[PDB]
UniProtKB/TrEMBL annotation, chain A:
Location(s), subcellular: Host Golgi apparatus membrane; Host endoplasmic reticulum membrane; Virion membrane
Family (UniProt): Belongs to the phlebovirus envelope glycoprotein family.
Domain of life: Viruses
Protein name: Envelopment polyprotein
From TrEMBL, chain B:
GO cellular component terms, A-Z: host cell endoplasmic reticulum membrane; host cell Golgi membrane; membrane; virion membrane
Record keywords: Disulfide bond, Fusion of virus membrane with host endosomal membrane, Fusion of virus membrane with host membrane, Glycoprotein, Host endoplasmic reticulum, Host Golgi apparatus, Host membrane, Host-virus interaction, Membrane, Signal, Transmembrane, Transmembrane helix, Viral attachment to host cell, Viral penetration into host cytoplasm, Virion, Virus entry into host cell
UniProt keyword annotation of Glycoprotein present: yes
Name the UniProt record assigns to this protein: Envelopment polyprotein
GO biological process terms on file: fusion of virus membrane with host endosome membrane; symbiont entry into host cell; virion attachment to host cell
Subcellular location(s) of the protein: Host Golgi apparatus membrane; Host endoplasmic reticulum membrane; Virion membrane
Primary location recorded for the protein, binned into one broad class: host cell
Residues of the full protein shown: 154 to 469 of 1197
This protein's record includes keyword tRNA-binding: no
Family label: Belongs to the phlebovirus envelope glycoprotein family.
Length: 54, 301
């Protein structure tokens, strides 16, 4: 004589996930460095057409 | 960057007490020679901060120019028995240096001149924390940091390091961490003011201007290549001097216009002389600002 008891705790109504992401607050830090013209990279064509990854 | 890479104004001496074995090519420092304590500073992809500002003096050059004082001892022995003073200040620094080196100078906490010395013929390792037995050994030191010396008269003793949430940064100790401690390899710049200590900062903001000091002006004589000439001999307005010199509006606006009786053609530097830093909102001129690579021990509890 073997028994198979199934005890029920409570009834929960969870939500199924699909698309998730991690967010949060951020505050950048500005760093400036003025360079004169005709000195190293101080030119009129290097500041305008400047890439955001170099 | 700066076009003047090997030309060093003033004295240009790069030798420390105990390792005076390279004065034949590093005293002074010119385009020729082979100075082990200066060739590694102009390497691409290694110390870009030194390549950005190259018209000013270095650390040893600032020591020889009566700007940066010397520690005690100035060059500790990294092999002597019964310990050595240059140990705790070196194990906390995570820097790399090539082989065949015997000395490696850096900056202490009091802003003086603290370095190490290896007796011949003992070479260093990859990290430089300990020496070992033995191509050719370098007859000089290796700069463990990336700072440049300059002359300033701005007081900053009350501007102590205010790095919040950090137990021990670099070498200095803010407090005694008794609970938790987070050890990580992070890069933090530093700055040294007049009559202060090695103050650490988060962000670095540079500033380039000019003045009326002779260090902000260069000149060359005309003779039968490029030949350097002492610009300090240019007389002032209504004063005296030695050899005359002339130039454009920038050089003539500072000294006296001679032209017909001048012996050289003076010019203006490519933005050098006064380098100020943005700290506490205001603008102050440091003495030996750099950007080293050490180990920062942040808090947790």
């Amino acid at each position: 004589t073997k028994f198979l008891k199934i005890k029920t705790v409570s009834s929960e109504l969870s939500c199924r996930e699909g698309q998730s992401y991690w967010t949060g607050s951020f505050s950048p830090k500005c760093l400036s460095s003025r360079r004169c013209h005709l000195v190293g990279e101080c030119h009129v064509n290097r500041c305008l057409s400047w890439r955001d990854n170099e | 960057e700066d076009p003047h890479l090997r030309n060093r104004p003033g004295k240009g001496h790069n030798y420390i007490d105990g390792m005076t074995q390279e004065d034949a090519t590093c005293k002074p420092v010119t385009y020729a020679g082979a100075c082990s304590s200066f060739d590694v500073l102009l390497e691409k992809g290694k110390f870009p901060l030194f390549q950005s500002y190259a018209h000013h003096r270095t650390l040893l050059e600032a020591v020889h120019d009566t700007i940066i004082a010397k520690a005690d001892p100035p060059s500790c022995d990294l092999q002597s028995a019964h310990g050595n003073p240059c140990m705790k200040e070196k194990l906390v620094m995570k820097t790399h240096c090539p082989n065949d080196y015997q000395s490696a100078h850096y900056l202490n906490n009091d802003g003086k001149m603290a370095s190490v010395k290896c007796p011949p013929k003992y070479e260093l390792t990859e990290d430089c924390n300990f020496c070992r037995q033995m191509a050719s050994l370098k007859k000089g030191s290796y700069p463990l940091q990336d700072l440049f010396c300059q002359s300033s008269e701005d007081d900053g003793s009350k501007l102590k390091t205010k790095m919040k949430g950090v137990c021990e940064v670099g070498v200095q100790a803010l407090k005694k961490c008794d609970g938790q401690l987070s050890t990580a390899h992070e890069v933090v710049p530093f700055a040294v003011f007049k009559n202060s200590k090695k103050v650490y900062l988060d962000k670095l903001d540079l500033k380039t201007e000019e003045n009326l000091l002779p260090d902000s002006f260069v000149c060359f004589e005309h003779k039968g290549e490029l030949k350097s000439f002492d610009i300090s001999q240019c007389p002032k307005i209504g004063g005296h001097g030695s050899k005359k010199c002339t130039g454009d509006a920038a050089f003539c606006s500072a000294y006296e216009c001679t032209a017909q009786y001048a012996n050289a053609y003076c010019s203006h530097a490519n933005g050098s002389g006064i380098v100020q830093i943005q700290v506490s909102g205001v603008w102050k001129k440091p003495l030996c600002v750099g950007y080293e690579r050490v180990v920062v021990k942040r808090e947790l509890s």
